[PDB]
Amino acid sequence: TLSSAMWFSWGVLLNSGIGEGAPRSFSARILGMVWAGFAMIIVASYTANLAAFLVLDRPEERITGINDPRLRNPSDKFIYATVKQSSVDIYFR
Amino acid sequence: PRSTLDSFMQPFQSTLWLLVGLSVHVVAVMLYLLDRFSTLSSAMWFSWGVLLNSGIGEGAPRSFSARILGMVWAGFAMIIVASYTANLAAFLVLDRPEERITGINDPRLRNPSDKFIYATVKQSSVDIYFRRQVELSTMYRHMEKHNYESAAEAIQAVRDNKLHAFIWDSAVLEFEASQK
Amino acid sequence: KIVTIHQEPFVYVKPTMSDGTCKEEFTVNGDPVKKVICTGPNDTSPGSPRHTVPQCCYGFCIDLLIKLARTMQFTYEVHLVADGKFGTQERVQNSNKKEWNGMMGELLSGQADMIVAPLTINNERAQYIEFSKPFKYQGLTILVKKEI
Amino acid sequence: NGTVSPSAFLEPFSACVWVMMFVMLLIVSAVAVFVFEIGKAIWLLWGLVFNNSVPVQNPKGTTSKIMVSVWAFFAVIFLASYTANLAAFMIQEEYVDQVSGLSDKKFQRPNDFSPPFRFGTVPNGSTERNIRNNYAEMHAYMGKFNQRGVDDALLSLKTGKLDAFIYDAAVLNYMAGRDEGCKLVTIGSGKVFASTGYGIAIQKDSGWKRQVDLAILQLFGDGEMEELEALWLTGICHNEKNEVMSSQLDIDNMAGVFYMLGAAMALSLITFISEHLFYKS
Amino acid sequence: CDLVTTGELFFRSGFGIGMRKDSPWKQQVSLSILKSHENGFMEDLDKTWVRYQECDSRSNAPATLTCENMAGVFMIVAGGIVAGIFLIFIEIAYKSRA
Numbered sequence: 173t174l175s176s177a178m179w180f181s182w183g184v185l186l187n188s189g190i191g192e193g194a195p196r197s198f199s200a201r202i203l204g205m206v207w208a209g210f211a212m213i214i215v216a217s218y219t220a221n222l223a224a225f226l227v228l229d230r231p232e233e234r235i236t237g238i239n240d241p242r243l244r245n246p247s248d249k250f251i252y253a254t255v256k257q258s259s260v261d262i263y264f265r
Numbered sequence: 266p267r268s269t270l271d272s273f274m275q276p277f278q279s280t281l282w283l284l285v286g287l288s289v290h291v292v293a294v295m296l297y298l299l300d301r302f303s304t305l306s307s308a309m310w311f312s313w314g315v316l317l318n319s320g321i322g323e324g325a326p327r328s329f330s331a332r333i334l335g336m337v338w339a340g341f342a343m344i345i346v347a348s349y350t351a352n353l354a355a356f357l358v359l360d361r362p363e364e365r366i367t368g369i370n371d372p373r374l375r376n377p378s379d380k381f382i383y384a385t386v387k388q389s390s391v392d393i394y395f396r397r398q399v400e401l402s403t404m405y406r407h408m409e410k411h412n413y414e415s416a417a418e419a420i421q422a423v424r425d426n427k428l429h430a431f432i433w434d435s436a437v438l439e440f441e442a443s444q445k
Numbered sequence: 446k447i448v449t450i451h452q453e454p455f456v457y458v459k460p461t462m463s464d465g466t467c468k469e470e471f472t473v474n475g476d477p478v479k480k481v482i483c484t485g486p487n488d489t490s491p492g493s494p495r496h497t498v499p500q501c502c503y504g505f506c507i508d509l510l511i512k513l514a515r516t517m518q519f520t521y522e523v524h525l526v527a528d529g530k531f532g533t534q535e536r537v538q539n540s541n542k543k544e545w546n547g548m549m550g551e552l553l554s555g556q557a558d559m560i561v562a563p564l565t566i567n568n569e570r571a572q573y574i575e576f577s578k579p580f581k582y583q584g585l586t587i588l589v590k591k592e593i
Numbered sequence: 594n595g596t597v598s599p600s601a602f603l604e605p606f607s608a609c610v611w612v613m614m615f616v617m618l619l620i621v622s623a624v625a626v627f628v629f630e631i632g633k634a635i636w637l638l639w640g641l642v643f644n645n646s647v648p649v650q651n652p653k654g655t656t657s658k659i660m661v662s663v664w665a666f667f668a669v670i671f672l673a674s675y676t677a678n679l680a681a682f683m684i685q686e687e688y689v690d691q692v693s694g695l696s697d698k699k700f701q702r703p704n705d706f707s708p709p710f711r712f713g714t715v716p717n718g719s720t721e722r723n724i725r726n727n728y729a730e731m732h733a734y735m736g737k738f739n740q741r742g743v744d745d746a747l748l749s750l751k752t753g754k755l756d757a758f759i760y761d762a763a764v765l766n767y768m769a770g771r772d773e774g775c776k777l778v779t780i781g782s783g784k785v786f787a788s789t790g791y792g793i794a795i796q797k798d799s800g801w802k803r804q805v806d807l808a809i810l811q812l813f814g815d816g817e818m819e820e821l822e823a824l825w826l827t828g829i830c831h832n833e834k835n836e837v838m839s840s841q842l843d844i845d846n847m848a849g850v851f852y853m854l855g856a857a858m859a860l861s862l863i864t865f866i867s868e869h870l871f872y873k874s
Numbered sequence: 875c876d877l878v879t880t881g882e883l884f885f886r887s888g889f890g891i892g893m894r895k896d897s898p899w900k901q902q903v904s905l906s907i908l909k910s911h912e913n914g915f916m917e918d919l920d921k922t923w924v925r926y927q928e929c930d931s932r933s934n935a936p937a938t939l940t941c942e943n944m945a946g947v948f949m950i951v952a953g954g955i956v957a958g959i960f961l962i963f964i965e966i967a968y969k970s971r972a
């Protein structure tokens with residue numbers, strides 16, 4: 173229960189069932205109890221992490237359409253245009 | 266709000282439960298069959314706790330192919346756990362649909378219906394803004410009816426659901442709903 | 446006489462294989478693709494030799510033409526516009542009398558009977574050219590690179 | 594409710610990753626005898642494949658059990674993989690049930706399915722007057738489902754007295770906008786049979802045609818039509834890019850995955866009597 | 875796949891056969907084009923051209939996964955297994971001569 177201990181908590185965080193034995197001291201067994209609790213907390217941590225790993229994609233692509241403020245005030249930043257001599261342009265004239 | 270709790274019931278349908286339990290004992294009987302063809306009650310014990318994943322821990326299936334049967338079984342158990350997970354995803358994110366009230370351009374307000382009732386104070390400076398314009402002319406035409414004397418009364422009225430909506434100046438109302 | 450312009454969704458312009466020959470290919474739906482010869486220059490650049498060869502063409506609009514054919518049976522020849530554009534109004538560099546260029550132009554001048562094209566339907570052209578019911582419904586849009 | 598998520602979205606979280614799970618799993622099986630100096634490996638790392646099940650004792654090998662720690666990190670990581678799979682259930686709603694097409698099959702043969710299916714339109718439908726040319730049997734069978742008035746028809750759909758309804762895209766769009774709650778929508782993106790439109794026809798053989806033509810032409814000239822739909826066609830509902838959601842965790846499809854389980858157990862019976870037959874010689 | 879349609883849709887518009895001034899051909903043509911839209915001829919035209927979808931839809935996607943991550947994790951796993959053979963022999967010697 174010396175090296176086998178660190179064995180026990182290491183595998184505990186692994187939750188893989190090494191399974192040698194347990195802490196004898198009741199209060200200390202409560203220490204490891206809270207420990208394994210925090211391990212579950214680390215698992216859940218990986219869960220919420222995964223939530224970040226999936227939902228909530230990046231921000232807007234702009235291009236909201238003809239009312240886009242972007243297009244409303246031309247900037248050297250973005251360039252939006254059409255065909256030379258476009259019926260489209262004829263609508264724009 | 267209409268979203269909360271429902272506990273062990275929420276994250277499934279009764280039929281699914283019938284599948285889990287009934288088919289669970291079924292595949293258990295299949296395991297016992299794999300035992301007696303070529304650990305009897307202890308088997309159904311083993312798969313039952315397997316779906317429980319609680320570590321009953323008596324023993325294991327001897328037949329290698331059958332042990333693969335239970336292998337896929339426990340796999341489907343993990344699948345049931347994940348099932349509870351996605352279930353929980355439904356139990357949290359993706360709330361109900363829109364509350365309408367998108368503002369003065371709400372199509373709802375654009376075409377008055379006996380359905381929703383939105384109005385303001387009788388003789389309201391608000392109304393004074395609504396008086397001379399081309400656009401609301403329909404609206405102002407529709408809004409004489411249910412207008413009230415004191416906005417507080419309106420608060421009471423929608424608060425009794427006798428109103429769909431009320432028109433006033435914002436800050437006051439921010440204070441109001443901020444209160445209730 | 447029918448005229449058009451190379452346009453991605455509809456007109457497809459490739460040379461003949463040897464001469465006047467268009468490689469016969471099927472569809473993903475297995476259809477025996479109908480195609481026909483088409484005349485227009487391969488230049489697209491301004492200020493370059495305008496000499497014209499019939500290359501091959503196929504496409505949506507082309508199909509619609511054939512539909513006219515089995516509907517109204519008559520001979521037809523198909524060509525593109527002198528330029529690489531549709532058209533706009535304008536005047537001469539001097540004296541400014543109202544003029545036109547483009548498919549509209551060859552039409553008003555009379556260089557062709559028919560314009561087959563994703564034709565914008567405006568107010569102005571109808572003050573000159575006749576219209577049909579629409580054979581498609583399109584509208585304006587904008588395009589940009591997808592998000593990395 | 595839905596939607597069409599038969600537990601294989603987890604495979605979208607993995608796909609060939611599973612193949613790697615088999616192969617590399619066998620690699621670990623080789624690691625058992627490797628760090629040792631059979632099926633024990635299977636029940637062991639496959640034990641890691643999820644929460645422990647097989648009671649089988651861990652290998653006493655120190656370095657061996659260290660490898661067990663390797664497949665342990667692999668395991669918890671995999672549980673995470675399924676976490677993000679459930680995430681794939683969070684978003685990713687097809688929101689597609691009966692949507693097929695005007696000429697499509699599911700509506701082609703009414704008697705085909707088991708539960709009675711019914712759809713149709715109002716009499717004298719211009720749209721319907723096309724539908725007769727669309728297919729004859731359609732008008733024939735839908736004759737019994739004809740209905741008088743649009744509103745009570747809608748109320749019969751919400752109530753369920755009818756499955757779906759046939760009409761022009763007009764009231765589909767506008768009516769689609771206005772409802773107490775947001776529920777109904779047309780099938781698909783708005784793919785419309787009989788491409789057509791509203792206009793104003795007049796006394797035939799006039800000249801006023803070209804005039805009014807140029808007129809509403811100019812109406813798109815100012816683009817005032819924008820203002821026009823703005824005062825009318827503007828919807829509250831839809832914006833179907835959002836996939837909405839469901840609840841109750843009601844899955845017949847995932848139960849289908851359970852059927853994949855049971856059927857796999859049948860395969861286990863096959864190979865079971867097979868290996869039983871291998872016991873002769 | 876590189877590009878995406880704009881957000882809204884505006885300037886309601888359409889396509890019809892270009893023909894000059896006044897010639898009887900107008901009526902015949904358009905009448906015929908209704909004579910198509912009456913049936914799936916046009917939709918058939920999609921099937922001939924528009925229908926074929928070379929890439930997925932506009933999306934932005936909910937999600938999807940391919941073997942990249944799992945390649946890294948499983949990578950540290952297997953390289954750790956070989957590491958377990960190396961250190962396995964090492965500690966095997968240590969305890970053997972201990």
Ligand SMILES: *[C@@H]1O[C@H](CO)[C@@H](O[C@@H]2O[C@H](CO)[C@@H](O)[C@H](O)[C@H]2NC(C)=O)[C@H](O)[C@H]1NC(C)=O
Pocket residue numbers: 716717741742
């Ligand atoms: C659709 O049109 C038909 C006729 O084309 C209408 O049929 C009439 O219906 C009324 C009452 O339903 C009868 O009194 C007449 O005798 C019918 N006439 C014929 C010629 O059938 C029918 O009513 C129309 N649809 C609706 C909803 O009114």
